[PDB]
Amino acid sequence: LPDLAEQFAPPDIAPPLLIKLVEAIEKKGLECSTLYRTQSSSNLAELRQLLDCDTPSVDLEMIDVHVLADAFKRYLLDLPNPVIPAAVYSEMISLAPEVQSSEEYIQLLKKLIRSPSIPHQYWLTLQYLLKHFFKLSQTSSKNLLNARVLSEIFSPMLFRFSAASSDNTENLIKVIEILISTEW
């Protein structure tokens, strides 16, 4: 897919294709207790065709919820740079020893992702997703998706954990889990 900085630009709040995917999933899966936890029958290719470029792509409201869910995950995996760029992830790991509390690690993420050499689209995209995840956790009774479960599923795709250690992994999943909860 094109870079997130190429998919949209401020005043616009999120990439057009991601808003479409997210609104269809919310429309059809708010109370689905298997959403994000099952695989649809499609393979990449069927999913990539749908990743809405100048054609194929149908009206996403006609697509099965599980296929939209898989398409959502494929979209995060196919971005040229992940939602949390590798330079950011990298500094989070090496500055970890200088950070004193869980809150300062959360604030470091925010400072780093908003560096002047990281386009505004990265932070805006991260904000749009945190809001979608917060919305889902509000109906957690039903869908079973709490901020923790959602961070465990999506943190590996947002940061693109290649070979992260268990405590760095645990610390970054905690950061995203708390960022979801504070969208209140």
UniProtKB/Swiss-Prot annotation:
Disulfide bonds: none annotated. The record marks 37 as: Arginine finger. Isoform 2 is expressed in skeletal muscle and brain, and at lower levels in kidney and cardiac muscle. Isoform 2 and isoform 4 are present in skeletal muscle (at protein level). The modification Phosphoserine is found at residues 40, 165. Heterodimer of a regulatory subunit PIK3R1 and a p110 catalytic subunit (PIK3CA, PIK3CB or PIK3CD). Interacts (via SH2 domains) with CCDC88A/GIV (tyrosine-phosphorylated form); the interaction enables recruitment of PIK3R1 to the EGFR receptor, enhancing PI3K activity and cell migration. Interacts (via SH2 domain) with CSF1R (tyrosine phosphorylated). Interacts with PIK3R2; the interaction is dissociated in an insulin-dependent manner. (Microbial infection) Interacts with HIV-1 Nef to activate the Nef associated p21-activated kinase (PAK). This interaction depends on the C-terminus of both proteins and leads to increased production of HIV. The lineage of its organism: Eukaryota, Metazoa, Chordata, Craniata, Vertebrata. The SH3 domain mediates the binding to CBLB, and to HIV-1 Nef. The gene is PIK3R1. Binds to activated (phosphorylated) protein-Tyr kinases, through its SH2 domain, and acts as an adapter, mediating the association of the p110 catalytic unit to the plasma membrane. Necessary for the insulin-stimulated increase in glucose uptake and glycogen synthesis in insulin-sensitive tissues. Plays an important role in signaling in response to FGFR1, FGFR2, FGFR3, FGFR4, KITLG/SCF, KIT, PDGFRA and PDGFRB. Likewise, plays a role in ITGB2 signaling. It is linked to Agammaglobulinemia 7, autosomal recessive: A primary immunodeficiency characterized by profoundly low or absent serum antibodies and low or absent circulating B-cells due to an early block of B-cell development. Affected individuals develop severe infections in the first years of life. Belongs to the PI3K p85 subunit family. Residues 1-184 form the Rho-GAP domain. This is Phosphatidylinositol 3-kinase regulatory subunit alpha. Polyubiquitinated in T-cells by CBLB; which does not promote proteasomal degradation but impairs association with CD28 and CD3Z upon T-cell activation. In adipose tissue, polyubiquitinated by the BCR(KBTBD2) E3 ubiquitin ligase complex; recognized by KBTBD2 through the SH2 domains, undergoes 'Lys-48'-linked polyubiquitination leading to its degradation.
